C-alpha cells in the first residue's frame, strides 16, 4: 500500500456520509461506497433504485461468482436483502492490484437508500463477528489485510465541517499534528470503547459512568450524529442551556424539529459551550479528552440567502452511545485492530474562520473514577 496516495480519497460531508470510489468486477464498474465502521458487510446496489444513479450489474462482470445464497440485514430503522457473491475489486488510489472479496448485491431494501445520499453501496469495516449471514463471510478489510500484506490498521479523517481520507493499512503523518492518544477497544464487534465522563463547558455531568456504556459506546463513521442514551442526552441539553450566555434555543431545537437561525454572520458562537468526552488511556490510571467546539454540534443547514440556519448535531439513542460524524469531523481516528485500540488526534482540517473547532488533551487522573465503566 501507498498511504500518501490515499490522502483525499473520500468525498462527502457529515450529514450525507463519506464515500470511497471502488471499481468492482471485469471490466470494472465504478461505485461510490459509504465508509461504515459500524457494520461488517460489503454491499452495493444490485438494481436501479430511487436516490441512486448507478448499481453493480453482476451480469456484466466476467469474474463475478454467485455463492448461491442471500443475506438479509435488519437495522432499527431500515433493512436490505442481497445476493452474496465474490468478485475482484480495485481501490484506484492506494493499491497496485485487484483483490478477491465477498460482495452482497442488494435487490430489495426498506429505508436504506435515502434522499440526498451520493453513495450506492456500503463498506463495513467493523469486526467479523458482525458479518452476515455469519462471521464466516470474510470481511472486506480481512481480505485486504490478507491479500495486500498491509498491517491490520486503518485510519479515517473527515474534513466536511471545515472530502476526507481513508488510509488502509496505517497512519498518514501529514493528516495530524500534535499527539495521538489511544483508548482500548473493550469489545471487538463494533469499535466499542470506554467513556469515563462527559463535560459541558468544563462542568462534568453528574452521572454514574456506567450510564455512558450500558448500551455500548462505539465509534461509527456510518452514523451522522452524536447519539446519546436518553438520560445522558437530557443531561447534555440541560447543561448546554445552562451554559449559553444568552438563551437561544427552543425545546424543538434540542429534539431536531426546529432550526435555529441568525442573519448572515450574526451567529453568537462565543455564547455556546465546548463539549468533552473523556476516554480511558491504555494505562488505566490516565484518561484523555476529545473536545468539540459549538461549530461542530451547532450544524449549518439550508430560511433563504439572508439567514444562516442550524440544526442540533446530537440526538437521543435507543441502543448505543454513538460517536458519529458530528465528533469524527474533529479528529483523525485510528482503528488499530492489531493492537486492540482506537487512536485520536485533532484534525488540522477541522478549522473554520481561522480557528480549530476541536481539541484533544491529557493526561487526566482516573483515580476518582471506577476501574470499569462498562457494566459488569
Amino acid at each position: 500500500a501507498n498511504f500518501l496516495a490515499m490522502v483525499d480519497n473520500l468525498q462527502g460531508d457529515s450529514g450525507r456520509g463519506y464515500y470511497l470510489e471502488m471499481l468492482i468486477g471485469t471490466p470494472p464498474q465504478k461505485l461510490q461506497i459509504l465508509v461504515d465502521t459500524g457494520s461488517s458487510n460489503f454491499a452495493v446496489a444490485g438494481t436501479p433504485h430511487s436516490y441512486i444513479d448507478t448499481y453493480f450489474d453482476t451480469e456484466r462482470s466476467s469474474t463475478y461468482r454467485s455463492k448461491g445464497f442471500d443475506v438479509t440485514v435488519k437495522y432499527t430503522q431500515g433493512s436490505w436483502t442481497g445476493f452474496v457473491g465474490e468478485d475482484l475489486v480495485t481501490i484506484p488510489k492506494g493499491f497496485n492490484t485487484s483483490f478477491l472479496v465477498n460482495i452482497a448485491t442488494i435487490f430489495e431494501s426498506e429505508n436504506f437508500f435515502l434522499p440526498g445520499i451520493k453513495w450506492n453501496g456500503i463498506l463495513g469495516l467493523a469486526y467479523a463477528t458482525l458479518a452476515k449471514p455469519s462471521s464466516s463471510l470474510e470481511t472486506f478489510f480481512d481480505s485486504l489485510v490478507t491479500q495486500a500484506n498491509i498491517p491490520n490498521v486503518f485510519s479515517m479523517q473527515m474534513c466536511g465541517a471545515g472530502g476526507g481520507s481513508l488510509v488502509l493499512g496505517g497512519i498518514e503523518p501529514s493528516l495530524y499534528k500534535g499527539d495521538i492518544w489511544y483508548t482500548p477497544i473493550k469489545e471487538e464487534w463494533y469499535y466499542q470503547i470506554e467513556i469515563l465522563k462527559l463535560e459541558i463547558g468544563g462542568q462534568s455531568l453528574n452521572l454514574d459512568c456506567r450510564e455512558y456504556n450500558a448500551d455500548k459506546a462505539i465509534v461509527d463513521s456510518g452514523t451522522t450524529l452524536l447519539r446519546l442514551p436518553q438520560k445522558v442526552f437530557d443531561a447534555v441539553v440541560e447543561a448546554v442551556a445552562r451554559a449559553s450566555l444568552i438563551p437561544e434555543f427552543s425545546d424543538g431545537f434540542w429534539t431536531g424539529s426546529q432550526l435555529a437561525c441568525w442573519t448572515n454572520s450574526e451567529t453568537p458562537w462565543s455564547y455556546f459551550p465546548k463539549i468533552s468526552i473523556y476516554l480511558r488511556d491504555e494505562n488505566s490510571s490516565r484518561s484523555f479528552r476529545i473536545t468539540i467546539l459549538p461549530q461542530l454540534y451547532i450544524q449549518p443547514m439550508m430560511a433563504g440567502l439572508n439567514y444562516e440556519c442550524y440544526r442540533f448535531g446530537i440526538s437521543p439513542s435507543t441502543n448505543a452511545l454513538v460517536i458519529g460524524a458530528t465528533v469524527m469531523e474533529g479528529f483523525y481516528v485510528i482503528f488499530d485492530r492489531a493492537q486492540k485500540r482506537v487512536g485520536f488526534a485533532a484534525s488540522p482540517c477541522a478549522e473554520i474562520a481561522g480557528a480549530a473547532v476541536s481539541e484533544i488533551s491529557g493526561p487526566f487522573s482516573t483515580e476518582d473514577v471506577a476501574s470499569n465503566c462498562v457494566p459488569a
Partner: nanobody
Amino acid sequence: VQLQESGGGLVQPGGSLRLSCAASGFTFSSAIMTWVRQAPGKGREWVSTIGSDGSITTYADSVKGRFTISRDNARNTLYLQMNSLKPEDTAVYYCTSAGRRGPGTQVTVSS
C-alpha cells in the same frame, strides 16, 4: 472454525511439496481461501487466494507459475502444489479464512 495445515518438509532447491489444509466448523464450499507465508525476521507474505467454487485464483508475483492453488469442496480441503522450490520460499505456510488461520506448516528449502 478450525484450519489445519500439513504437507511441509525439508527439500532441496528445485524440489516440490503438496500442502493441504483441512477445514472444519464452517461451510468450506462457500469460503474464499488463502495461503500466506512468514519466515523469521520477515513480514507476512501473501501467496495465493482461491474463490469458493475454485474458478478464480490469484497469485503473488514471487510464486506465479511455480505454485498452484486448488481445493476439493467435498473433502473440506485446500491445497498448494509447490514446484521448482527455491531457498527464498522457506517459511511457515498458513491457510486463512475470515481472519482465522491454522498453526501452519514449515517449508524449508536448502542445499
